[PDB]
Design a protein around this nucleic acid. Sequence first.
RNA 1: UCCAUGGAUCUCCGAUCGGGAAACCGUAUCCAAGCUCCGUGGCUAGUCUGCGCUCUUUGGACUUUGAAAACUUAGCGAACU
RNA 2: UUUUUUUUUUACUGUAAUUGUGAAAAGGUUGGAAGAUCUGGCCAAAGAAGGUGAUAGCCCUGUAGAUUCGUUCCUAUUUUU
RNA 3: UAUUCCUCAAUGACCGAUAGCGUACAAGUACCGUGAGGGAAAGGUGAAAAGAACCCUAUGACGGGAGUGCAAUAGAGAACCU
RNA 4: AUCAGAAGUGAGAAUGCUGACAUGAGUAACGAAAAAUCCUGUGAAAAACAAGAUCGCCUGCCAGUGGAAGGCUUUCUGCGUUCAGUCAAUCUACGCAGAGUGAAUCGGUCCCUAAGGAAACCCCGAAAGGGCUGCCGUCCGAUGGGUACACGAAAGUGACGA
Lengths: 110, 52, 158, 71, 130, 44, 34
Amino acid sequence: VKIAKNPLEEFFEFDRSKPVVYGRGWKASELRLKSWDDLQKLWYVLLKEKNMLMTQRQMLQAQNMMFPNPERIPKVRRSMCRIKHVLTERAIEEPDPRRSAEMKRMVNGM
Amino acid sequence: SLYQAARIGEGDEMIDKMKSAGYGELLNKKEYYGFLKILCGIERLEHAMSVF
Amino acid sequence: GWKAAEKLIRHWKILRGDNVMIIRGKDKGETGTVKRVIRSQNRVIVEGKNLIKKHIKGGPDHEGGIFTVEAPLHASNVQVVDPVTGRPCKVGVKYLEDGTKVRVARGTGTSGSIIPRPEILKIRTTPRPTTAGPKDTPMEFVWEQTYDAKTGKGMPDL
Amino acid sequence: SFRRKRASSLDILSPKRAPRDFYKGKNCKPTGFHTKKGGYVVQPDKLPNYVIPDLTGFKLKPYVSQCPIEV
Amino acid sequence: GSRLGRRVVHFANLPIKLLMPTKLTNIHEFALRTIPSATKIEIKRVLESLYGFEVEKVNTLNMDGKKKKRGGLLIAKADYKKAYVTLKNPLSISGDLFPVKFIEEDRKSKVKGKKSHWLDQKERREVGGY
Amino acid sequence: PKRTFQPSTIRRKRNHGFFARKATKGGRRVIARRIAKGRHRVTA
Amino acid sequence: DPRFMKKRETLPEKTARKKKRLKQINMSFVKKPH
RNA sequence: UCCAUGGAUCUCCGAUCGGGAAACCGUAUCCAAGCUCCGUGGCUAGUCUGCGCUCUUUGGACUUUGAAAACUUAGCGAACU
RNA sequence: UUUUUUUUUUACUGUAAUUGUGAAAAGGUUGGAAGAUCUGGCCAAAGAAGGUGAUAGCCCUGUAGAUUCGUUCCUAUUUUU
RNA sequence: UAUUCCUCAAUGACCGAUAGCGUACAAGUACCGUGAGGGAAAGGUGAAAAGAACCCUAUGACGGGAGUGCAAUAGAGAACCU
RNA sequence: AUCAGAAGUGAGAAUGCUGACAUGAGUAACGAAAAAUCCUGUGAAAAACAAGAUCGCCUGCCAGUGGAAGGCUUUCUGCGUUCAGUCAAUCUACGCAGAGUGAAUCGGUCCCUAAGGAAACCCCGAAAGGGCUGCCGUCCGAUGGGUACACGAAAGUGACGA
Ligand SMILES: [K+]
Ligand SMILES: [K+]
Ligand SMILES: [K+]
Ligand SMILES: [K+]
Ligand SMILES: [K+]
Ligand SMILES: [K+]
Ligand SMILES: [K+]
Ligand SMILES: [Mg+2]
Ligand SMILES: [Mg+2]
Ligand SMILES: [Mg+2]
Ligand SMILES: [Mg+2]
Ligand SMILES: [Mg+2]
Ligand SMILES: [Mg+2]
Ligand SMILES: [Mg+2]
Ligand SMILES: [Mg+2]
Ligand SMILES: [Mg+2]
Ligand SMILES: [Mg+2]
Ligand SMILES: [Mg+2]
Ligand SMILES: [Mg+2]
Ligand SMILES: [Mg+2]
Ligand SMILES: [Mg+2]
Ligand SMILES: [Mg+2]
Ligand SMILES: [Mg+2]
Ligand SMILES: [Mg+2]
Ligand SMILES: [Mg+2]
Ligand SMILES: [Mg+2]
Ligand SMILES: [Mg+2]
Ligand SMILES: [Mg+2]
Ligand SMILES: [Mg+2]
Ligand SMILES: [Mg+2]
Ligand SMILES: [Mg+2]
Ligand SMILES: [Mg+2]
Ligand SMILES: [Mg+2]
Ligand SMILES: [Mg+2]
Ligand SMILES: [Mg+2]
Ligand SMILES: [Mg+2]
Ligand SMILES: [Mg+2]
Ligand SMILES: [Mg+2]
Ligand SMILES: [Mg+2]
Ligand SMILES: [Mg+2]
Ligand SMILES: [Mg+2]
Ligand SMILES: [Mg+2]
Ligand SMILES: [Mg+2]
Ligand SMILES: [Mg+2]
Ligand SMILES: [Mg+2]
Ligand SMILES: [Mg+2]
Ligand SMILES: [Mg+2]
Ligand SMILES: [Mg+2]
Ligand SMILES: [Mg+2]
Ligand SMILES: [Mg+2]
């Protein structure tokens, strides 16, 4: 109903019912107040949401059905861009050379 | 650990908690020199002089 | 059939919600209020004027029949009504004491009063939702602070 | 999403449309080294490690609420 | 710190798009779509660490994007990679989730056109491929 | 009858490929001429 | 520490400027609805 | 939305770290210096010193000049007519 | 170290203000629609040009200019071994 | 003093869709050749899409009425002014 | 208008150039001496489509199995008949939409070389370039030789015709 029982149930929108309403995305001024732990957790929450939205679009388009509310995906995408810009902005402002060069790798690493 | 992670306020408050917990006789000159070495190695000289 | 090499209008002296008078066309001499401005065609829609009749075929979703909606006018076919004398007038630009741009009546025979900016512009076209959604962060959680560079609150796991 | 290309881009050789000994690859990162006997050895230091913190009990959400509160 | 490993990733961004399986109960494997530069070890570790799967094996294949040519004009979609992931324990998907019921009801529209013995199993493992 | 074009991809790349044209001075002038004309397929 | 011590347009630029002007000229006319 | 200035990110070939069926493959460069964390060895054992790498800063060792229409100056230099 | 400030004045292809500002009245008739025709006012350092339901100086965007910004100068970039 | 891969402004008893650059239109494209290389065609509804609801006859309206519009042989799906 | 001026200035023919449209003419032809017949169904229309029954043809180079070279989605499912099929086609290798290719062992990548190609060093040459691949010497190149570490070699070999 409200909680997935499996990891497979996380690729679906379980709260979709009555028009459902979604908010706007995070602003950089709102992200500048949060810690690194909260920003990492928010990055992974947005990553799971983006995987759900792309899965839902693919599943609905595979049966010639329309994808409802396509504007959810760019909101998540640009919020995830803003998180990385905020973290890189802090990594510039770090005064120790080794710590700054390690924080830039922690942000941009892949 | 908190001084190596540059969490200066929490490390200071942990110092004060160790004071109020009745362990303050352990802070000899050696451990304060260790804290100063950590802070100077991570370039926090203002808090290093505060700890001084 | 848009054969003419027509440039765009970059700064509009005609705003949505203004009271105008149509000076040219089939409905010449009739007053109204601007409902929408089509910028990409240099055209406006006057509320209830310049009507057309559309034959729309109805399917399983929309109703058929012959409807009647407004058709756009060209943006040079309307002219702003002077608020004092009621006759149409031109619009010029005046700077106030602060240095705020306003629109003043211009033309010989006009009062030179200030054309007021319509009040419909501040009202949102899509109103804000009453209730939050199940994936919306309430504003009491966003505004809390966990990062502080001076005290070193919330530093990473270096 | 459909996007426009050039019709001359079909001439670039790809291993799906090539003789059997043509190898191109897809810019994946390597994880080990080739042997002299045609095998492969996976060096475990080159495998990626993911640091994903525990997300249970987190209070922030993907979207920010847009209810009318104040100017 | 950097002494922990040569390749440490703190912000993964691997996009995974799940394909809807045929049956709702006793799922032993599932398929997904991702970018062509993903590796079996990357997909297995992302799926284990981020979602909590118990992955046994990962099998991949490459696909070309769909193309349309009308004599000089060419339009196309991006290439993708399809992966099969085999689970150690069977899982299930509830019917009440959107858009599962619509997918099944649209799938059954296209396809319109007893002697049990002793020691006979019921739910056997249905895994394809090599 | 046996016609004149008998295809082989490795022979095509070894005679009219990019690095086969880039190897000699005549082929480099061919590449310059093609780019100056504006051909979409500079090499074969 | 040696850190705390105190210490014409090219042809590609002209081509990029011309290209941007060429786009801006096309974007100055009334769009034909279709 | 848009504009001005400054920033963060910024895949690959052409192409130059090596190979090459252009858009692919393989790649921790090397050596001195001084600094937080790390582990291990050894003393008569206390603000005791001595060995290493990984990653960071500052130098210096190897090399990567590089395109382009016409004009200019040179070399060799026809035949039809 | 920073901030406020005395700071002259012209030139400018600076083809600067992408697209800033920038003058000029009403009636009658025909016509699908007025810019046409008749009566009759006004601007011009602006009657180059392009639109608006036909051919518009005064319906729209512009144009001449006038204001604002910014390169030299006044106001020397000096002082030290 | 020479030239224009380039930039800005201006002019024409220069051309006006078999003309003018090969290209007014997604052209060095389509297409031809192993390769160097050769190399096209194709402009216009109406002021505004108001682009023909509805009825009849055919499998099917592009037909006959009705309606929009000044005008419907001005009724088109890279094409409808004369 | 008139009077002057500048010319890419006047078409019936160049086996002239480009486009459009006639004639032959509703004529030839509908492409391998395997071959078709019927009941039912769908549809506006069935000799040509679906399913079934009866008959025939191919069996070591037109006709069966797997696949190299080449092709590049032609594969499968639903919808459709504007184009194509030597049809008036409901069908399809045709149009629209979606889906499909799972490897430690298969085939490659990797290691090693042949014929051959190229750098370095050296030699020659108006320029461009040409030779040389070894006495100490490098990198590529299968149509061949190899399948559970790295380094070295005055050890054996790998190793071969009709
Ligand atoms: K002669
Ligand atoms: K001006
Ligand atoms: K007008
Ligand atoms: K005018
Ligand atoms: K007509
Ligand atoms: K002739
Ligand atoms: K084959
Ligand atoms: Mg990145
Ligand atoms: Mg128009
Ligand atoms: Mg592109
Ligand atoms: Mg293939
Ligand atoms: Mg690569
Ligand atoms: Mg595979
Ligand atoms: Mg290279
Ligand atoms: Mg030069
Ligand atoms: Mg201007
Ligand atoms: Mg004006
Ligand atoms: Mg004009
Ligand atoms: Mg007319
Ligand atoms: Mg032409
Ligand atoms: Mg003509
Ligand atoms: Mg023509
Ligand atoms: Mg070709
Ligand atoms: Mg119709
Ligand atoms: Mg006309
Ligand atoms: Mg002539
Ligand atoms: Mg003639
Ligand atoms: Mg003849
Ligand atoms: Mg002819
Ligand atoms: Mg006959
Ligand atoms: Mg005859
Ligand atoms: Mg006959
Ligand atoms: Mg029958
Ligand atoms: Mg049959
Ligand atoms: Mg027989
Ligand atoms: Mg034979
Ligand atoms: Mg096809
Ligand atoms: Mg088929
Ligand atoms: Mg046919
Ligand atoms: Mg038919
Ligand atoms: Mg069919
Ligand atoms: Mg098909
Ligand atoms: Mg093998
Ligand atoms: Mg050799
Ligand atoms: Mg040689
Ligand atoms: Mg040589
Ligand atoms: Mg070489
Ligand atoms: Mg080799
Ligand atoms: Mg072989
Ligand atoms: Mg042998």
